[PDB]
Amino acid sequence: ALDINSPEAEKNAKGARARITCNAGNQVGSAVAWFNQRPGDPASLLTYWAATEKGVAGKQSAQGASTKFSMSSAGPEAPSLSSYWCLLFEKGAFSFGGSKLNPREGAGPQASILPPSADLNTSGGAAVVCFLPNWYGNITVQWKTEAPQSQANMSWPGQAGANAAYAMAAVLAITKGDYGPGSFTCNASNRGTGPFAMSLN
């Protein structure tokens, strides 16, 4: 099969222009389709034969001769911040790449650590929850129970409609028997400086 490669899984753009690039593992002869998928909805055909729209808003244009294709959004709006896919229809086994847009903002992370509740402690469990509700970019969370831990489960939302900032929840599940290692700290490493360490004892 022919490998279709969209390099940037995430692109930032607010109201000016987006140029999503699709790279094909083989010369596909200008045969690349483009799909627009909002979350929870099926992919919608935008541009076939790498230049031709299908009942689509005029802002979506495309370009590309062979092995290098682009889709341009010259007027990107709130609906245009969706997940964009490129497909080959040159070879028998059809292939897709995957890419997404998001708006631009500033920065600034926030962190808060929460110990397990008494109810959870009663029923043989202890979950320490670290919340990182508002920040821009990508972030890493480290757990120190006086030593690094690698049993934490992490989850990230999409982008807030108003705040235009991401969040993160890190849950450390420990049994009651193993709940005596000292003090628990959650450390955050965003595009800032220094570890945002919040701790409980």
């Binding site: 045969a31 389709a33 799909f35 909805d41 099926p42 992919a43 919608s44 055909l45 076939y48 034969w49 299908k54 997940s83 896919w85 497909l87 229809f89 028998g92 086994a93 059809f94 292939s95 897709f96 995957g98 997404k100 808060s112 650590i113 929460l114 110990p115 397990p116 509740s117 109810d119 959870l120 029923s123 469990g125 979950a127 929850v129 919340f131 509700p133 489960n153 992490m154 989850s155 990230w156 939302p157 807030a160 969040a167 993160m168 929840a169 849950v171 599940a173 409980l200």
Partner: protein, 203 residues
Amino acid sequence: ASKLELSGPAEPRGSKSAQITCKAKGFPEARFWVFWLFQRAAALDWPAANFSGGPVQFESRFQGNASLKGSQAQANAELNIGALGSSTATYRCGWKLANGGFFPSWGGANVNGAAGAKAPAVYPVEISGAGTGSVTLGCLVKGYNAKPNLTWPGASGALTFPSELNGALWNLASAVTGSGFPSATCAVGFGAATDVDKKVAAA
């Protein structure tokens, strides 16, 4: 118009079999290849395609795992899936233009190949004895096997994080940035007859 209506969500168990239907409208189904697609965590794959009046062509990965058929008497195309365990994804049934190979019409149906069906447990995670301006309260939901809905009484500052699998059950958290703290409660709504609402106390 050409529209493809699929079955609802399916919940097989481990190594069962799931049959996914795709009713077709607006076009002669016998004239077009109806395709199938496999989207697990935002990465579109291509199981196979079926020409409703003849051949079926599979991907080399899904040889023997997928089994496509078309009940051309009706306007129905089916995908039967064999052994399971990591096939939890969203399955589409596109159809290709009769000249190009691209997909104009699409569907969308989600499979969930897990085991168990339990009631969620609510834990009111709270502050650790600190406060400055606005404070972050929380609510932990642990141990359920469906799609829940966490809410707060008329306060819109909440962030409900996507649920994650830990073993065979789902876990979720909710965080609220409340300035004043007279009284705050976390109310969860679960499909399997669970509507527990727990308040968040201090310390």
